């Protein structure tokens, strides 16, 4: 199995998730 690839996409997902959830929270604070 492509362990390295999976690591990279793990990081990619976490980044997207922190980013998206982050800005969503901020949107609601300002709502």
């Amino acid at each position: 199995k492509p362990k390295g690839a999976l690591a990279v996409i793990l990081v990619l997902t976490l980044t997207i998730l922190v980013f998206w959830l982050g800005v969503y929270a901020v949107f609601f604070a300002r709502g």
């Binding site: 199995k1 492509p2 690839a5 999976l6 996409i9 997902t13 997207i16 998730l17 998206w20 969503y24 949107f27 609601f28 300002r30 709502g31």
Partner: protein, 166 residues
Amino acid sequence: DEHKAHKAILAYEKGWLAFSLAMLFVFIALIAYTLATHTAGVIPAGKLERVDPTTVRQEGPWADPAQAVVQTGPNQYTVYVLAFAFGYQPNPIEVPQGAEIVFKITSPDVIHGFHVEGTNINVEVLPGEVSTVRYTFKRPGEYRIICNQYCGLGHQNMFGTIVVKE
């Protein structure tokens, strides 16, 4: 080896493709949500409302900034903002807290930004058109308006004020 790795890579890429697809869909679901709540008020009403930039200061609801605040509901106020080079009228905009504020904003010269600091109100202002957004201020006090769209050399100093009374 090379034959094996190809099967494994592709096997997991299909996994990944499905997972990211879900995540994107879940976002879509979460975005669809916000359109159902009051926070969606800041989204501009998509309707076209043409005005004449050249005469907007001589005649109409933008002509007397002192009267740009108008009670249109039991708990609702329309405000006729002019974003121009380089400032906003009225200054300040005064609205009461808890009331739904319908901002009708336009420009007599170039395109400006209307971004109310601390809030989700962030709308482009186009000459010839009235931008319409809706907000209810939940905390009293002094919010700042910022012009986030380049409008010339006065851009960096173009600021406005909304005062929210208890």
